[PDB]
Design a protein around this ligand. Structure first.
Ligand SMILES: *[C@@H]1O[C@H](CO)[C@@H](O[C@@H]2O[C@H](CO)[C@@H](O[C@@H]3O[C@H](CO)[C@@H](O)[C@H](O)[C@@H]3O)[C@H](O)[C@H]2NC(C)=O)[C@H](O)[C@H]1NC(C)=O
Ligand SMILES: *[C@@H]1O[C@H](CO)[C@@H](O[C@@H]2O[C@H](CO)[C@@H](O)[C@H](O)[C@H]2NC(C)=O)[C@H](O)[C@H]1NC(C)=O
Ligand SMILES: *[C@H]1O[C@H](CO)[C@@H](O[C@@H]2O[C@H](CO)[C@@H](O)[C@H](O)[C@H]2NC(C)=O)[C@H](O)[C@H]1NC(C)=O
Ligand SMILES: *[C@@H]1O[C@H](CO)[C@@H](O)[C@H](O)[C@H]1NC(C)=O
Ligand SMILES: *[C@@H]1O[C@H](CO)[C@@H](O)[C@H](O)[C@H]1NC(C)=O
Ligand SMILES: *[C@H]1O[C@H](CO)[C@@H](O)[C@H](O)[C@H]1NC(C)=O
Lengths: 415, 139
C-alpha cells in the first residue's frame, strides 16, 4: 500500500476538480437527465444515464444513453476522462433497467426490457426480454438477446431485473447485480430477529421481519437480491445461472453493485429498509453468493418517515438513497463514499473517508445547498496514487436543466 | 427559503377544515414537517398510515389503487416525523418529485385504531376530512 492519509484529519486536500465535458447537455431544459451509472475498469469506463421528459423516473425515460471511454493522462498531474463512443439504446423506450460493466477494454450494458412498465408487479420474467448491448471506441454497437429460457435458477423465481451500479467480469464469465421476485416466503431472518427493539404493537417480531421483504406494491411478492452469472463464447454459446444472495443478514431487495478492487470483489447493497447503516462486504463465497458483511456503525443514508438516518431497528418501511462506496486500503479497512449528510432530505453530498468505526475525514462537495440522490464512486491507481471519480445525481438549478455531475479527487498523502 | 409551521397529524387538529381539508401554498426549497403525536395523558393514541394519492383518490377517499405510503404511526411511545423539502429528488421509494405549479395530495384511510390501521377505503379522510393539499408556486 502506497503513502496517503490513513488516520483522522481536518480540512484535507482532495484536489477536487469537476468534469463537465463528458455528459451531454440538452438544448431542451425540460428534459431530465437522471439515474447516472458508471463502471471503470482497466483504464476504460462505461457511463449510462436516463433522459426523460419532465420526469426523473427511469421507467418514464424515453431514451437512455450509453457511452464508452478511456482514462488518460494529459500531463495535467491528474486522471482525465476521454469519451470514445456514444449511442442511445435501441429499445430505450421499453427499458426497465440497465447495468454497466467494463471488460477487456469494451463496454457492456445488461438490460431488462418490457412492454409493461409495472412488469415487476404483474408479470413474470418469461414475458419480458433481456439484452446485452456492447461496443467499443472504433466499432458499432451490437445488442444480443440473452436466452433466458435456458437458465438454471438456484431457487424458483418468478421474475428478475438487472439492478445496480455496475457488474464485473471475471475470466470468461460476467456477474451482474440483480433483484429477483419469488411469490412464497422461503426466507429465514435470524439477524433481524436478533434485535431487542420497540415494535409495532399487535405484531410479532418474526412477523414484522418476514413482512419486510414483501414488495410495497404487490404484497404477495418478495424481492430478494442476487446475482446473475453469464458464461459466454463470442456471444453465441451461453450458460446462465441465477443465484440469490446469502440469507445471512437479508434486506429488502434493492439496487446494489459488484466491483473488483484491491484483488477482491466488493459487494454493496443500498439500504432501502429498516436497517439504515451501510450494507457492504467482500465476496468470500460465490455459491451461494456470500458477502462478508461489514459491521458499520457510522456510515448511513437519509430517508423520510419511520426509517431515517442511523435507524437500526426492525420495521416494515421502504426508501432511502443509493450512495455506493469503494475500498481504499484493506489494512486500515478504509472506504470512500459520496454520502448525503441529512436525516431525511436528500441533499448535501460529502466525500467521506471512513473505517468501520469512525469517519476519518470528509469534505462537502458543494458549499451551497445541493440536491442529490444517487451517488456512485469508483477508485483507481494513477501515477501510483489513489484517485477517485464520483458521479452524482443532482438537481442544481431548481428543477430545470437536471443533469448529473462528475468529479475527480485524490486521496490526501498527508494528514 | 422558509421552514413552514409543522403540521401535527391527529383527529384533534383544527388546521383541517371539514370541507377544504388543509391547504398551503409552499414555495420550492421550503422545508415542512408532518408529525405523529405520541399518546398524551388521558387521550387514546391514534394509529394511522399516511398515503400520497392522486386527486381522483382524494375525492373518492380510497388509497387502494397505488400505495405510496410515507409514514405509518404505529409507535405510540416515541414520536416519529416526516420532513419535506419541496425540491425534486426526495429519497422516496416510489419516487417523488416536487415541481412548480403542481398539486400534491396526502391523506389517510385508517380507522384511527390499531385494528383499522390498514383500511384502504374511506376512513378519517371521509369523516374529519384529514388531508393535505399542496399547490406549489401558487399565491
Ligand atoms: C477506525 O479508525 C480509527 C482511526 O482514527 C481508529 O481509531 C484510532 O485507533 C488508534 C490505534 O489503533 C488510536 O491511536 C492511539 O492514540 C492514543 C491517544 O489518544 C494513544 O494513547 C495510543 O497509544 C494510540 O497510539 C487512536 O486514538 C484512535 N482514534 C480515536 C479517535 O480514538 C480505530 O482503531 C479504527 N477501528 C477499526 C476497527 O479499524
Ligand atoms: C401480485 O402478484 C401475484 C403473484 O405473482 C400475481 O398473481 C398471479 O397472476 C398471474 C397472472 O398475472 C396468474 O397467472 C397467477 O395465477 C397469479 N398467482 C397468484 C398466486 O395469485 C398478481 O397478478 C399480482 N397482483 C397485482 C395487483 O399486482
Ligand atoms: C374499523 O374498521 C375495521 C374493519 O372494517 C374494524 O375491524 C373489524 O370490526 C368488525 C365490526 O366492527 C369486527 O366484526 C371484526 O372482527 C373487526 N376486525 C378486526 C381485525 O378487528 C374496526 O373495529 C373498526 N374500528 C373503528 C374504531 O372504527
Ligand atoms: C475479455 O473478455 C472476454 C469476454 O467477452 C473473455 O472471454 C476474455 O477472456 C477476456 N480477455 C482476457 C485477456 O481475459
Ligand atoms: C461483522 O461481524 C460478524 C460477526 O460479528 C463477522 O462475521 C464479520 O466478519 C464482521 N464484519 C467484518 C467486516 O469483519
Ligand atoms: C412488446 O414487446 C415484445 C417483446 O418484449 C415484442 O415481442 C412485441 O412485439 C411488442 N409489442 C409491441 C411493441 O406492440
Amino acid at each position: 500500500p502506497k503513502i496517503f492519509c490513513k488516520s483522522v484529519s481536518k480540512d484535507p486536500d482532495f484536489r477536487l476538480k469537476q468534469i463537465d465535458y463528458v455528459i451531454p447537455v440538452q438544448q431542451d431544459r425540460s428534459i431530465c437527465m437522471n439515474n447516472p451509472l458508471l463502471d471503470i475498469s482497466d483504464g476504460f469506463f462505461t457511463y449510462i444515464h436516463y433522459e426523460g421528459i419532465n420526469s426523473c423516473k427511469k421507467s418514464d425515460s424515453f431514451k437512455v444513453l450509453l457511452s464508452h471511454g478511456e482514462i488518460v493522462d494529459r500531463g495535467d498531474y491528474r486522471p482525465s476522462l476521454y469519451l470514445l463512443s456514444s449511442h442511445y439504446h435501441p429499445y430505450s423506450m421499453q427499458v426497465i433497467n440497465c447495468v454497466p460493466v467494463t471488460c477487456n477494454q469494451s463496454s457492456f450494458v445488461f438490460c431488462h426490457i418490457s412492454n409493461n412498465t409495472k412488469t415487476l408487479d404483474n408479470s413474470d420474467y418469461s414475458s419480458d426480454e433481456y439484452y446485452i448491448t456492447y461496443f467499443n471506441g472504433i466499432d458499432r454497437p451490437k445488442t444480443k438477446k440473452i436466452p433466458i429460457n435456458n437458465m438454471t435458477a438456484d431457487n424458483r423465481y418468478i421474475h428478475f431485473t438487472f439492478s445496480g451500479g455496475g457488474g464485473v467480469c471475471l475470466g470468461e464469465e460476467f456477474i451482474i447485480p440483480v433483484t429477483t421476485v419469488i411469490n412464497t416466503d422461503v426466507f429465514t431472518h435470524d439477524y433481524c430477529e436478533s434485535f431487542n427493539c420497540s415494535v409495532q404493537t399487535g405484531k410479532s417480531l418474526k412477523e414484522i421481519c418476514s413482512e419486510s421483504l414483501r414488495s410495497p406494491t404487490n404484497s404477495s411478492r418478495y424481492n430478494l437480491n442476487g446475482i446473475m452469472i453469464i458464461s459466454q463464447n463470442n456471444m453465441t454459446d451461453f450458460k446462465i445461472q441465477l443465484n440469490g444472495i446469502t440469507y445471512n443478514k437479508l434486506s429488502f431487495g434493492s439496487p446494489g453493485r459488484l466491483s473488483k478492487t484491491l484483488g477482491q470483489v466488493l459487494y454493496y447493497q443500498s439500504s432501502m429498509s429498516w436497517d439504515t447503516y451501510l450494507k457492504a462486504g467482500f465476496v468470500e463465497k460465490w455459491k451461494p453468493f456470500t458477502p462478508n458483511w461489514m459491521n458499520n456503525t457510522v456510515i448511513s443514508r437519509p430517508n423520510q418517515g419511520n426509517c431515517p438516518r442511523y435507524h437500526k431497528c426492525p420495521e416494515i418501511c421502504y426508501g432511502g438513497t443509493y450512495n455506493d462506496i469503494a475500498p481504499l486500503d484493506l489494512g486500515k479497512d478504509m472506504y470512500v463514499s459520496v454520502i448525503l449528510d441529512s436525516d431525511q432530505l436528500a441533499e448535501n453530498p460529502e466525500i467521506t473517508v471512513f473505517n468501520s468505526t469512525t469517519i476519518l475525514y470528509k469534505e462537502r462537495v458543494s458549499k451551497d445547498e445541493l440536491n442529490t440522490r444517487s451517488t456512485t464512486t469508483s477508485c483507481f491507481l494513477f501515477l501510483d496514487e489513489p484517485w477517485c471519480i464520483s458521479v452524482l445525481e443532482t438537481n442544481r438549478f431548481n428543477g430545470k436543466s437536471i443533469r448529473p455531475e462528475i468529479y475527480s479527487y485524490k486521496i490526501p498523502k498527508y494528514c | 427559503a422558509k421552514n413552514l409551521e409543522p403540521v401535527s397529524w391527529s383527529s384533534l387538529n383544527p388546521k383541517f377544515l371539514s370541507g377544504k381539508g388543509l391547504v398551503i401554498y409552499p414555495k420550492i426549497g421550503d422545508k415542512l414537517d408532518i408529525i405523529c403525536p405520541r399518546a398524551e395523558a388521558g387521550r387514546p393514541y391514534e394509529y394511522y398510515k399516511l398515503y400520497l394519492v392522486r386527486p381522483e383518490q382524494a375525492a373518492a377517499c380510497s388509497t387502494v389503487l397505488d400505495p405510496n405510503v410515507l409514514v405509518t404511526c404505529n409507535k405510540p411511545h416515541q414520536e416519529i416525523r416526516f420532513t419535506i423539502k419541496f425540491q425534486e429528488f426526495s429519497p422516496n421509494y416510489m419516487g417523488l418529485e416536487f415541481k412548480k405549479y403542481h398539486d400534491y395530495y396526502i391523506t389517510s384511510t385508517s380507522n384511527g385504531s390499531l385494528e383499522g390501521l390498514e383500511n384502504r377505503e374511506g376512513g378519517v379522510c371521509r369523516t374529519r376530512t384529514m388531508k393535505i393539499v399542496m399547490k406549489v408556486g401558487q399565491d
